[PDB]
Structure 1
Amino acid sequence: SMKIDVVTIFPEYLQPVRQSLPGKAIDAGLVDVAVHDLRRWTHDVHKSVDDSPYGGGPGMVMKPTVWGDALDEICTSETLLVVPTPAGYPFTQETAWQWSTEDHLVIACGRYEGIDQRVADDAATRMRVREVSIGDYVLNGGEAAALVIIEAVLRLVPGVLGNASLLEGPSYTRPPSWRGMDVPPVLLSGDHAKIAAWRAEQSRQRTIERRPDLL
């Protein structure tokens, strides 16, 4: 039973999440995802969410006063506050497993150069805060990271998304022959110990080739 609140200046970006949520999971009260426009907490007629960086530099920084108000309203002491950032701890499958049993995730999506650091630092004095990165590339903001985190986490919550070391090897299905390429005959052999060993060797070879760091 998980509530996820996402805060963003581009709420439309989170549309895929609401799309991928089965009615049965919502009706059973297994999951609730709500998306909030950060500008609801702006102070001025211009709905300002950013300002120039202290110490100079390029880009802009999201305002602490706006974010502070948003998180004050949405979070409680029990919230796990997730803050995507290219400077975060790595988000991994282990992370996803840990977070899948949380009652309440709040994902604070930044833009520009990110969020004034005092927002996360202040929040961390009264709730659990996690600054994380989904990989070693640079995005424009936290929304795509939120999509990835939400999917990785919710697919581990029994019955929410509709789904049920070494790298996975190649997979095959019908037809047995296609554009001159036959499915490896071992897979049609009915020798299931041999099939498992073949799959194990494929996994080994692929890991050596594509992810030697895993070895």
Structure 2
Amino acid sequence: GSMKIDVVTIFPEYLQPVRQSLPGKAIDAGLVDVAVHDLRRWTHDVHKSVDDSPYGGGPGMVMKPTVWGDALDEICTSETLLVVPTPAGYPFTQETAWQWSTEDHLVIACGRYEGIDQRVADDAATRMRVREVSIGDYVLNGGEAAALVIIEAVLRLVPGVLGNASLLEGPSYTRPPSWRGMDVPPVLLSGDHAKIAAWRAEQSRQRTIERRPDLL
């Protein structure tokens, strides 16, 4: 219904595309508010440091717990659902999106480098609900693109926000009826709607077997 989303990142301009995709009517009706915060506002030093070397050695850098702790202390409450994107997370799915779509307050903590010192999420989980999640079986450079995916999948399930209204879906067609020597399947122009439904069901079955045998 009415949702606030706060995103914390060292690249706040990355999140401009979705602030723009929000219909004015939804904002004016008080249905949604998305705010983006530069993590460097909570740094301690003149060099605005957000990362440091990993304990135990190895390549890369780790984001600092003292900076992230201060940021989340200010932005979160006991009622916040804290979302931490990570390729080592639980899978984010359509079920997850439906569940989160009724939340009052999401906070998304975007990592870079090797990620965030684990004590940040572990400390937060002693006083709010925390969810570490992966958006797929690949490695991104940062959490910003993951935040864009999560925000879009969730907000399209909130009535009236983004301006929109198993087996895989089969192919779709529209005008013109013939194009570059390819005709639309004649069954779709037949006016036999029980037959059309059966044809679509079989197309779905075939596509699922070919592309996603795991779903069977």
TM category (shorter chain) comes to over 0.9
Deviation track 1:122-146 (CA, whole Å, cap 9, x = no partner) reads 0000000000000000000100000
TM-superposed CA distance for 1:19, in Å, is 1.2
Query: What SS does the aligned partner of 1:206 have?
Result: helix
Query: What SS does the aligned partner of 1:43 have?
Result: coil
Percent identity of equivalent pairs? 100
Query: What SS does the aligned partner of 2:161 have?
Result: coil
In the alignment, the residues of structure 1 paired with residue 17 and residue 194 of structure 2 have an alpha-carbon distance, to the nearest angstrom, of 41
Deviation track 1:29-87 (CA, whole Å, cap 9, x = no partner) reads 00000000000000000000000000001100000000000000000000000000000
TM-superposed CA distance for 1:183, in Å, is 0.4
Aligned residues: 215
Deviation track 1:186-211 (CA, whole Å, cap 9, x = no partner) reads 00000000000000000000000000
Query: What SS does the aligned partner of 2:46 have?
Result: coil
Query: What SS does the aligned partner of 1:36 have?
Result: strand
Deviation track 1:4-27 (CA, whole Å, cap 9, x = no partner) reads 000000000001110110000000
Query: What SS does the aligned partner of 1:153 have?
Result: helix
In the alignment, the residues of structure 2 paired with residue 100 and residue 16 of structure 1 have an alpha-carbon distance, to the nearest angstrom, of 20
In the alignment, the residues of structure 1 paired with residue 114 and residue 214 of structure 2 have an alpha-carbon distance, to the nearest angstrom, of 31
In the alignment, the residues of structure 1 paired with residue 168 and residue 35 of structure 2 have an alpha-carbon distance, to the nearest angstrom, of 34
In the alignment, the residues of structure 2 paired with residue 17 and residue 44 of structure 1 have an alpha-carbon distance, to the nearest angstrom, of 31
TM-score, normalising length from structure 2? 0.99
TM-score, normalising length from structure 1? 1.00
Runs of 4+ in 1 over 2 A off after TM superposition: none
In the alignment, the residues of structure 2 paired with residue 155 and residue 145 of structure 1 have an alpha-carbon distance, to the nearest angstrom, of 16
Q: Which runs of 5+ in 1 are unaligned?
A: none
Deviation track 1:81-138 (CA, whole Å, cap 9, x = no partner) reads 0000000000000000000000000000000000000000000000000000000000
In the alignment, the residues of structure 1 paired with residue 18 and residue 113 of structure 2 have an alpha-carbon distance, to the nearest angstrom, of 23
Q: Which runs of 5+ in 2 are unaligned?
A: none
In the alignment, the residues of structure 2 paired with residue 137 and residue 114 of structure 1 have an alpha-carbon distance, to the nearest angstrom, of 15
RMSD between aligned residues: 0.3
In the alignment, the residues of structure 2 paired with residue 189 and residue 16 of structure 1 have an alpha-carbon distance, to the nearest angstrom, of 43
